[PDB]
Amino acid sequence: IWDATATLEALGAADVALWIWEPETDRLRLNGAARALGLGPLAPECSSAAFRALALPQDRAQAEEVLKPREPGSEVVARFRVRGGETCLWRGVWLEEGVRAAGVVAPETKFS
Amino acid sequence: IWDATATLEALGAADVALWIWEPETDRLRLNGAARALGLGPLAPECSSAAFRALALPQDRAQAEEVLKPREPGSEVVARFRVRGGETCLWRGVWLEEGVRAAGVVAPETKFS
Lengths: 112, 112
Description:
Chains A, B: This is GGDEF family protein. The structure is a homodimer of 112-residue chains. By secondary structure, the first copy, chain A, is of the alpha+beta class.
């Protein structure tokens, strides 16, 4: 079988987190290795303002590429550093139902 | 909050799957975008023999790098094609508890 602990074990092992972005509710949700990735202050849920504030200031254009609304099926690809210094790659898509995006965030030291 | 549907949504959006390998029980478990990745025949759970059989024959040395037992903390990094032709990257680690590994599997068309 598969459960919530299995999800966290695999995410932790990979050093990856999952994210869902809901502009309607101004809620970014994280699950998995958020702390390891420098995203600890944002987890389990944060506002778009909190998200932008954690990005290195010079990387905030790239951070915004995650939050920018897009039509369903639109790829989300972004890379930026947060306070602490580590660069992560965000990859996902705008979903079919609602105006929402979801995906993975990974350390670029392991994923490109 | 975060639940099982949120996990599947984010995994699906990223085109990624999670895996746990338990050599003690000869059980490889998958969760997420297994079908999209060519791993559909293995999901939700398979034997090591089923796993090897799905690899392209010439890629079976690389496939084995996933299943090979290692000491806790040992990185798992492998890349190989399965029947159908698509190349995926497997990244994870041998866990602290038991003799088990876990991680992510991703399409190399998106992740390197």
